[PDB]
């Protein structure tokens, strides 16, 4: 280590990490602690002033002491503690801390149901006519404040995805088969607590059709994530039900229709219709990853048995998402949504923000039944049922003095807006 020619002036022999010291009056000079200071070094001279841990804000995780009669207002619930730690750090000395997560019993839920409306989904529309109320009833078993929304999608409205015959532009399907014209994304219903409304509208929507098998749902997903007001998102847990019986188009497919300008990730609704499917490409998985994760969307993939392989795989690349097998006529959606919600709400995944060009980070997780985690697994805990507390040990290390200010980055469980501020202070001067 420091045993190899290292001596300089003040804030250098000091900023060479752990061992190295310089007493203020053989192998190497500025090298050790137990071999350097061993050979004539008084303990009043050395300059090794280090880093501290400052718990500036940590309201306790809400306990349920007051009982089953207290109905905790969503704003009072506290799942992550601390909330505003401050960390003084020196270049080489890990400054670890613990994070405590507890799963509260009840949180309001917005769920947006976004469905394939291509001809392949003919029978599925029929079954769904009563979904608005059955699902409300079921979802309330899990939440006091529930809202439901509905959105349909079919395809990009251009060569070669739909056929551009003037007659097929008006009926994409065959002779007797009535089909409404193709479209990209209809926002049928922004979020409401009125499930009858859901039912009233859903049975007014007509089935469409188009040409190529995969559909342009990624145009719709994006729009649902990025159009804040128009959809109705509140800062609560947000569920997007994406259900379909085909594969999906993504960036690079637009080229076939001369669409080569990448998706811009900005809202483009007018009359609750996406107006730019001609103009921007389908977004890449990575793009959706950014925007879902940026707008706290937890995604449920309700797809048919024959597209399970593709959607499991998609699930593996979308953090905080779930996939389930959807019946022929969508007969099992409701169970599915619940099955999906349970896994989502019983695992936690910790995501951090952007660090600086010489600052790393470690995660260690301590889950139920001694099941501990290291590395990338260090940010995961599953099998968390209501009331369970879990712990995370979080170390940060910097290499050398980067800025001379602070990087107030956040650590967050995917799905929740509950953050942990981690205000960093860098020590760059001698004493």
């Amino acid at each position, epitope marked *: 280590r420091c045993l190899k020619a290292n001596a300089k002036s003040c804030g250098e022999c000091i900023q060479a990490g752990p061992n190295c010291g310089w007493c203020t009056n053989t192998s190497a000079r500025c090298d050790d602690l137990e071999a350097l200071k061993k050979k004539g070094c008084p303990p009043d001279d050395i300059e090794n002033p280090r880093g501290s841990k400052d718990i500036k804000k940590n309201k306790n995780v809400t306990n349920r002491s007051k009982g*089953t009669a207290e*109905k905790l207002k969503p704003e009072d619930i506290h799942q992550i503690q601390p909330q505003q730690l401050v960390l003084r750090l020196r270049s080489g000395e890990p400054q670890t801390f613990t994070l405590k997560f507890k799963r509260a019993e009840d949180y309001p839920i917005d769920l947006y149901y976004l469905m394939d409306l291509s001809y392949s989904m003919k029978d599925d529309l029929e079954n769904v006519k009563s979904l608005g109320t059955d699902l409300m009833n079921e979802m309330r078993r899990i939440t006091s404040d529930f809202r439901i929304g509905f959105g349909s999608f079919v395809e990009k409205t251009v060569m070669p995805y739909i056929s551009t015959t003037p007659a097929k532009l008006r009926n994409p399907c065959t002779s007797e088969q009535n089909c409404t014209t193709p479209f990209s994304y209809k926002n049928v219903l922004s979020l409401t607590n009125k499930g009858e409304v859901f039912n009233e509208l859903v049975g007014k929507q007509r089935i469409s059709g188009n040409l190529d098998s995969p559909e342009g749902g990624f145009d719709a997903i994006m729009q649902v994530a990025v159009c804040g007001s128009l959809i109705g998102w509140r800062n609560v847990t947000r569920l997007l039900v994406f259900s379909t019986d085909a594969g999906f188009h993504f960036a690079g497919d637009g080229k076939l229709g001369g669409i080569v300008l990448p998706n811009d990730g900005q809202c483009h609704l007018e009359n609750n219709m996406y107006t730019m499917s001609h103009y921007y490409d389908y977004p890449s998985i990575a793009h959706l990853v950014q925007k879902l994760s940026e707008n706290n969307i937890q995604t449920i993939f309700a797809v048919t048995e024959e597209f399970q392989p593709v959607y499991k795989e998609l699930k593996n690349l979308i953090p905080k998402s779930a996939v389930g097998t959807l019946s022929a006529n969508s007969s099992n959606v409701i169970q599915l949504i619940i099955d999906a919600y349970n896994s989502l709400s019983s695992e936690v995944i910790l995501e951090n923000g952007k660090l600086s060009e010489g600052v790393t980070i470690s995660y260690k997780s301590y889950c139920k039944n001694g099941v501990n985690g290291t590395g990338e697994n260090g940010r995961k805990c599953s099998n968390i049922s209501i009331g369970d507390e879990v712990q995370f040990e979080i170390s940060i290390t910097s290499n050398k003095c980067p800025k001379k200010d602070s990087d107030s980055f956040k650590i967050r469980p995917l799905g929740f807006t509950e953050e942990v501020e981690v205000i960093l202070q860098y020590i760059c001067e001698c004493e």
Partner: antibody, heavy 118, light 113 residues
Framework: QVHLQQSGAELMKPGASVKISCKAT????????IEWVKQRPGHGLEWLGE????????HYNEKFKGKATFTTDTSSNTAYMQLSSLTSEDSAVYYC???????????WGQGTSVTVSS | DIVMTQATPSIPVTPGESVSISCRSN???????????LYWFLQRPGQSPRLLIF???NLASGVPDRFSGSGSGTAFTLRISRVEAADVGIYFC?????????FGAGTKLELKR
């Protein structure tokens, strides 16, 4: 699979005391409150108290303060209720059920009758 | 504290007809939530109570659509659409808002003949 299995019928003498149990399977014991309800032949249903298997958080109906005492055993997923100074008033069927602030008493045990006769 | 009154102790009903069953309250069970914390239970004879309605209006799983729930802040009625032999029993309300929790005395539902 969600089931609450209560202890069999008990026969006691006026002034004794008794321990009724309720075992929970099919769900994670420490996330739901257990509820205790009393049913007298002619007095309908009566809420006694509740307890969260985690820590000793308890909430009592005052009428029963120092009549009913609640405990849980996490290692065996069993909740317990003790009746003491038994009289004819205490002679009833006793139910345990399940609750959260949001969803109360979905599931119930089969019942336990405590008859108190010399 | 909160008292629950189920004025009618029993109602005879011809198998097929529809019945309202009412429950009054000392205090209003409407929370700031917008949730009214009132529950409804049915007890078949020689059996433990089963849940029916879980926040003034909401149905428990397995409880058929024949059972509906509604009410003000203080006046709640449960309606049943097509009374069967299976729906014979005692119907209890309960207030899940304040300690101690309170049931009314039930209403016994039996068939007319």
């Amino acid at each position: 699979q969600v089931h609450l299995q209560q202890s069999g019928a008990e026969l006691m003498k006026p002034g004794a005391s008794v321990k009724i149990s309720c075992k929970a399977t099919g769900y994670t014991f420490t996330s739901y409150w257990i509820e205790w309800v009393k049913q007298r032949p002619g007095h309908g249903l009566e809420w006694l108290g509740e307890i969260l298997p985690g820590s000793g958080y308890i909430h009592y109906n005052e009428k029963f303060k120092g009549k009913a005492t609640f405990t849980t055993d996490t290692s065996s997923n069993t909740a317990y209720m003790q009746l003491s100074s038994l009289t004819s008033e205490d002679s009833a069927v006793y139910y345990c059920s399940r609750a959260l602030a949001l969803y109360a008493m979905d599931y119930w045990g089969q019942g336990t009758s405590v008859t108190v006769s010399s | 504290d909160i008292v629950m009154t189920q004025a009618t102790p029993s109602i005879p009903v011809t198998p097929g007809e529809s019945v309202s069953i009412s429950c009054r309250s000392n205090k209003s069970l409407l929370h700031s939530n917008g949730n009214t914390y009132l529950y409804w239970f049915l007890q078949r004879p020689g059996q433990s109570p089963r849940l029916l309605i879980f926040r003034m209006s909401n149905l428990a799983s397995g409880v058929p659509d024949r059972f509906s729930g509604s009410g003000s802040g203080t006046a709640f009625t449960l309606r049943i659409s097509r009374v069967e032999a299976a729906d014979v029993g005692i119907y209890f309300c309960l207030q899940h808002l304040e300690y101690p929790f309170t049931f009314g005395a039930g209403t016994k539902l039996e068939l007319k003949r």
